[PDB]
Amino acid sequence: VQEIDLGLTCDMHVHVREGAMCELVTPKIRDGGVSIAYIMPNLQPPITTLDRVIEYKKTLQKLAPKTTFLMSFYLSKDLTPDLIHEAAQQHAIRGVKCYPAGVTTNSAAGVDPNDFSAFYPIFKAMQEENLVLNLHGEKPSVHDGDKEPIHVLNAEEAFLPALKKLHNDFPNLKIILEHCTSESAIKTIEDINKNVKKATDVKVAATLTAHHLFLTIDDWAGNPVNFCKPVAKLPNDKKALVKAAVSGKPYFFFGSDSAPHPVQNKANYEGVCAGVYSQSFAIPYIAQVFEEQNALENLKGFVSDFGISFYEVKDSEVASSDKAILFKKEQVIPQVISDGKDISIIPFKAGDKLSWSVRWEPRL
Amino acid sequence: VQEIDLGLTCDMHVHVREGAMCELVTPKIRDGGVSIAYIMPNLQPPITTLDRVIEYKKTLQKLAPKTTFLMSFYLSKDLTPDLIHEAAQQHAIRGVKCYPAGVTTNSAAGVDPNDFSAFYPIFKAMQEENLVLNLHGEKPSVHDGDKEPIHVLNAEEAFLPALKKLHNDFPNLKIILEHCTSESAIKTIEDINKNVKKATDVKVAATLTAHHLFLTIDDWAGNPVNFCKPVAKLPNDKKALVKAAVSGKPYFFFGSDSAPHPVQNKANYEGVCAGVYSQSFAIPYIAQVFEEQNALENLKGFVSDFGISFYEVKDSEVASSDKAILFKKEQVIPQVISDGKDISIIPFKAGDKLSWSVRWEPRL
Ligand SMILES: O=C(O)c1[nH]c(=O)[nH]c(=O)c1F
Ligand SMILES: O=C(O)c1[nH]c(=O)[nH]c(=O)c1F
Ligand SMILES: [Zn+2]
Ligand SMILES: [Zn+2]
Ligand SMILES: [Zn+2]
Ligand SMILES: [Zn+2]
């Protein structure tokens, strides 16, 4: 069977929750073919204190000794530049994640992106310490008022001005538009990186999920299992995301936004939790897309090289030197992912066949 | 206003199912303030025979003696012009309802709207007999190679040409675009109706639901109770729909598309049954919108006059001459609507309070 050495794969947008759910999903990072994971902070309550981010990381390390964990804070008014400096100097975080209030899971304690001025001391501190600003790039929805309507389909586009202003005001701060879903955002990212020759010059980048390379509005209209934020959009939006994923440009790399929810939290007549679970087969899912696009030679950049460069991950910190090897053995995605206890999860593309599997081969 | 005599109210798009669901729902037509109901045929199996439509109507008259029932056939492959003539000749149907295959509930036995040709003999029979052609105006989805993609968001616009072609080929056939959801469809309807002041001259009309005058994509993205076909669209679309509902134009009238489903069929992680249940408070829902638009003087036209005119309902046919009186007593919508057995339904806007109630006054 054909094999591809992906090296030290990284997934820069991971949700692993807490408690039993965290015990179930955290080992799946390695099983899905991911060596390095950027852990998002939207817990109940959000991670805003040094003590809880340190304890949280250790909990993950206990659950997966071979997975490299990059941690983050949740952008909040509780944060202070002093806390940022202290946490950065103790190597306890690599970035801060911004949730606008109301747009997704555990975003109620989030920010109004019609401001982002109140957090400039925070960004100033983050810029000094080389920390990354991760953005959930969606404006809260507005329907009345002569300003024009913001809904789930244009909320990402409506956010692009805020991104451009932040990059302008903090030109040396590393910023990521997480999980791009629209062609407009892909273009905005390319235009921001127009004068860029070295991958190491990228200051604004974007992550792409597995599921936004497959899904359009039709797949989640009627299927909460496929509902997530930002929602999958129109067929042209999908096309633009795939071209970027296979483009080889250093400002687009893999972030799954694997967002596990127990099935009973998706099977609601009301208040369906947003979020798609892709961790268990993260890298194989991406392989399908690069295969169908005849672009397997670019797979390594999208899932390894560009994320390592952008986050400046050194062999000094990786918890295991094992390389993820993709081998072309068909498998079937199970119907559920379960701990054999209270938790059952419906995986992305449940019941479908993947061309590729993934294994771990030692180095040297 | 405190009281408004709405007269002989009309709901020209009603689903009452069969069995216990029907026993629960059919009396709610009257309790919702509706005197006249156009009954849709997408049962299992679809209503495609004279005998079945008679027993259905008879089942409904035993559950609601004071409700006037206009019945319909399901446009299927089993229909024949002779059946159309015979059914019209016995006053057993007032129209035939078209479902594109796969787009909505119990539509698997429906038609491909890219080849309506095979049903033209049916349309000549309907045209001679002055029956109405009700259209669920959505093309089935396609994400294929050459042709432009069709999804739940443009499927109604993608259907407008077929509507125009049908109007051109059968200029005397009364045709309704049921449940309009897009500004593009509103434009197409007015345009078709550009040279019409008499109101008996309208041949193509469109019904507007209760829920589409409130909902946008944001309200059903995470709330299956609000998922329906055609989906609620963008704020601009709602804007056109509300404007048309209150416009006083005779080519737009009320059809609820009240579509009852048991709660367990909305709380799926996949395959959520499309459909919003509005029957229990049909008229109060519409009252809210006309109040908020300072247009209560147009309420009677939208829920009574224009539908009676277009369907040519004569006092010969009405099962009760009782008048619907809207009185401003503010009530609260239950969280559930139940028969006290296996069936529970989440009503539209469950738990909200409505300014208006409705009662029945006899004619004297
Ligand atoms: O995209 C996100 O930010 C997000 N974050 C989450 O914690 N859960 C989600 O389900 C989700 F869609
Ligand atoms: O919109 C329709 O046509 C429709 N008809 C139905 O019978 N049930 C539905 O749930 C529905 F959405
Ligand atoms: Zn997000
Ligand atoms: Zn996320
Ligand atoms: Zn319909
Ligand atoms: Zn219907």
Residue numbers in the entry:
A (entry chain B), B (entry chain A): 2 to 365
Authors' account:
Dihydroorotase (DHOase) is a zinc metalloenzyme that catalyzes the reversible cyclization of N-carbamoyl aspartate (CA-asp) to dihydroorotate (DHO) in the third step of the pathway for the biosynthesis of pyrimidine nucleotides. Dihydroorotase (DHOase) possesses a binuclear metal center in which two Zn ions are bridged by a posttranslationally carbamylated lysine. Crystal structures of ligand-bound DHOase show that the flexible loop extends toward the active site when CA-asp is bound (loop-in mode) or moves away from the active site, facilitating the product DHO release (loop-out mode). In bacteria and yeast, DHOase is monofunctional and belongs to the type II enzyme.
